[PDB]
Amino acid sequence: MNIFEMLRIDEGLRLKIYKDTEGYYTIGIGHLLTKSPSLNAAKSELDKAIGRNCNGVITKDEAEKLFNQDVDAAVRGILRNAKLKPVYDSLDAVRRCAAINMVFQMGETGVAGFTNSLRMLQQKRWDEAAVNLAKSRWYNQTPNRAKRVITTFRTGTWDAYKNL
Numbered sequence: 319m320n321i322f323e324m325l326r327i328d329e330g331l332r333l334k335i336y337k338d339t340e341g342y343y344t345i346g347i348g349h350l351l352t353k354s355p356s357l358n359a360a361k362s363e364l365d366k367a368i369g370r371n372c373n374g375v376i377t378k379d380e381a382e383k384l385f386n387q388d389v390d391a392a393v394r395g396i397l398r399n400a401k402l403k404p405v406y407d408s409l410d411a412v413r414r415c416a417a418i419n420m421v422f423q424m425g426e427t428g429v430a431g432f433t434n435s436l437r438m439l440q441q442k443r444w445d446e447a448a449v450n451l452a453k454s455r456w457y458n459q460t461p462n463r464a465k466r467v468i469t470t471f472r473t474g475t476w477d478a479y480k481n482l
């Protein structure tokens with residue numbers, strides 16, 4: 319597929335504010351609104367993001383536009399990061415999608431502990447990288463999604479997403 323199809327499978331689509339797997343207010347195709355426990359704070363973030371008063375509900379077009387912005391922000395964060403860019407540029411197109419997927423889910427700060435995984439990926443030691451990537455809170459907390467992403471890094475194919 320492509321990064322949009324991959325993340326749409328992993329994140330789903332919901333048009334009303336929901337909570338992600340960590341309990342944080344989210345909307346659309348996995349768009350984090352806030353880590354605050356305040357629903358009103360999440361609603362304010364939503365209105366700011368969409369540019370109108372939504373009271374917690376968006377259209378599919380709005381969800382898809384937010385998603386495009388979020389994917390682009392993940393790519394640009396990789397390209398501006400001196401640690402991530404060299405690894406990203408060493409990867410083929412399918413594995414670059416796996417990298418964007420992780421940055422979309424965890425952000426640049428969430429991936430900061432993956433330094434050894436990043437080195438193994440740049441060295442193209444795929445099985446070793448796959449084992450190392452699984453030794454993570456990420457894998458333990460979202461194992462099905464992590465297994466799909468790890469299989470993508472291990473094989474360089476879309477097999478985990480076609481199988482699903």
Ligand SMILES: Cc1ccc(I)cc1
Binds near residue numbers: 396420421432439
């Ligand atoms: C975990 C991870 C972070 C950034 C890249 I580029 C690849 C893998």
Ligand SMILES: [Ca+2]
Binds near residue numbers: 459460461462463464
């Ligand atoms: Ca999961």
